[PDB]
């Protein structure tokens, strides 16, 4: 079970630090938590007003990865539009609390499956909640979360990209470092790396359904601007 190379330990440091500096409320998300009261456009309203800072945190995460910063702005835009809801969904799923059955948004707002579903997310709310439940036994630390985020960001198959092959190599570096970190961490769950790769697929489905749903059916001034831009 190969463990992290030194060049991979500093990539682990770079990514973990980027995640921790752009992750809302850091460790005090549970205490700061505030429980909230077809589509409820009033529930919708409350959610659209609170997605802008969550999108901005993803932008900030990416900007703290030098490999991201090396790409042309046209590719940076494409990578961020692709992975934004994938990372927001992971960051909320890892904050699943089984006792209240809530996820935490912006490190401060606890929401139920029914609330998020009626905020306009539909089946995506069940997919995010199910992921959170499945992730409770994975005991993902900040490093494992940051690396998953970095794998999702460096997706070479987003349409319209120019630097397809450089982005692929960035991702291969992250995947190798991450598997080696997982070897070092020796989790007590069988076939951990294969099961983690299935969780990536789960997040990609959330990203592809999110994007599809925006497109579908829906007055757009009612949507935050940064959120119209990411669909």
């Amino acid at each position: 079970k190969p463990e992290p190379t030194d060049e991979e330990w500093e990539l682990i440091k770079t990514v973990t630090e980027a995640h921790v500096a752009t992750n809302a409320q850091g460790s005090h998300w549970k205490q700061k938590r505030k429980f909230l009261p077809k589509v409820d456009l009033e529930a919708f309203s409350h959610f659209t007003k609170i997605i802008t800072p969550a999108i901005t945190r993803v932008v900030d995460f990416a900007k703290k990865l030098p490999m991201f910063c090396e790409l042309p702005c046209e590719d940076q835009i494409i990578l961020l539009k692709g992975c934004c809801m994938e990372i927001m969904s992971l960051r909320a799923a890892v904050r699943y609390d089984p006792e209240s059955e809530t996820l935490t948004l912006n490190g401060e707002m606890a929401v139920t499956r029914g609330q998020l579903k009626n905020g306009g997310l539909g089946v995506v709310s069940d997919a995010i909640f199910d992921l959170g439940m499945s992730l409770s036994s994975f005991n993902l630390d900040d490093t494992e979360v940051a690396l998953l985020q970095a794998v999702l960001l460096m997706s070479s198959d987003r349409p319209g990209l120019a630097c397809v092959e450089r982005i692929e190599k960035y991702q291969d570096s992250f995947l190798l470092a991450f598997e080696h970190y997982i070897n070092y961490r020796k989790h007590h769950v069988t076939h951990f790396w294969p099961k983690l790769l299935m969780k990536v697929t789960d997040l990609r489905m959330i990203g592809a359904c999110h994007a599809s749903r925006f497109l579908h059916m829906k007055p757009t001034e009612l949507f935050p601007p940064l959120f119209l831009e990411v669909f």
Binding site: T56, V59, K63, C73, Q76, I77, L80, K81, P225, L226, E229, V230
Partner: peptide
Amino acid sequence: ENALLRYLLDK
């Protein structure tokens, strides 16, 4: 298009 995101990226 993608002009807020562009501003936020280029700093």
